[PDB]
Amino acid sequence: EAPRSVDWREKGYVTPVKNQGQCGSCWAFSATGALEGQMFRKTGRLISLSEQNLVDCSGPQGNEGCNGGLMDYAFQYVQDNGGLDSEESYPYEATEESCKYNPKYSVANDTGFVDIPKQEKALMKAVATVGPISVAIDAGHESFLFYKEGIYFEPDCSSEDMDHGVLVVGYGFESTESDNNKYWLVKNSWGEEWGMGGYVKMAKDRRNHCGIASAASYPTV
Ligand SMILES: *[C@H](O)C(=O)[C@H](Cc1ccc(OC(C)(C)C)cc1)NC(=O)[C@H](Cc1ccccc1)NC(=O)OCc1ccccc1
C-alpha cells in the first residue's frame, strides 16, 4: 500500500519551520502544523496558526502552557472553542500570557481528532492519505540536539517514552542509504538552524524508532 515517497510541502500543505524558543510549547507547534495541513486540504488557503492562542487558552483541556501539553488536547481546544486565531493576529511571545482569543480572527476549526494505531504501517497510510500528521518522539538525546544531516538513528532511543511533539510531512528513502534506507520526513520547531533547515529524517520502518508511531494523531476538520 501507499506511494513510495510522500512530501506534503510540494503540494503546499506546510508552513515554514518556526522556532518555539525557550518555551515548552512543542505540542502547540505540532498541533498548529497538523491543523494548518487539514485547513489547507479543506479550503485551499495555507494560513499560519497561532501557537500562542493554544499556549494561553487550552488550559481547560489539560495543557500546561510553556510547561508541556498534548496535541489531542490542542485539537480538543479548537473544537471546544469554536475556533483558533491566526499567527499574525495572535503572534508568538514564547511565554504564558492571559488567554487573548478573539473569535473575530478565527481562521480555523475542527470537529475532534483521530488517534492513529501504534504501528508505522498505519502512520504511513495516514500520511499518504490525510496530510501532515502530529507525532511525538523521544528527542531526549545529545545526538538529536546536535543533529545536522542524514537519517537520524539513535540506538538508545525509546519507542514508549516520547517527550517532543513534531510533524510528519512525508516519507521517503535514501538512494544513498538503502539497507536501512527509509525515513520519515519530520518538521521540527527549533528554527531553521537546527538539523537540515529545521527538518530531520527519522529512521523509518526500524521497529518504530524513537516512538514516532506511538502517539500520532490529526484533527478532523
Ligand atoms: C516540547 O518542546 C517538549 O519537548 C516537551 C518536553 C520537553 C523536553 C525538552 C525540552 O527542551 C527544549 C527542546 C529546549 C525545548 C522542552 C520540553 N514535551 C511535551 O510538551 C510533551 C510531548 C508529547 C508526547 C506525546 C504527545 C504529545 C506531546 N507533552 C507532555 O509533556 O505531556 C505531559 C502532560 C502535560 C500536561 C498534562 C498531562 C500530561
From Swiss-Prot:
The record marks 1-2 as: Cleavage. Zn(2+) 5 binds at residues 138, 141. Residues 177-179 form a propeptide. Zn(2+) 4 binds at residues 93, 97. This is Cathepsin L. Zn(2+) 6 binds at residue 161. Glycans are attached at residue 109. Disulfide bonds join 23-66, 57-99, 157-210. Zn(2+) 7 binds at residue 163. Zn(2+) 3 binds at residues 72, 115. Zn(2+) 1 binds at residue 10. The active site is at 26, 164, 188. The chain holds residues 113 to 333 of 333 of the full protein. Zn(2+) 2 binds at residues 51, 87. Changing residue 26 to S: Catalytically inactive. Unable to autocleave procathepsin L.
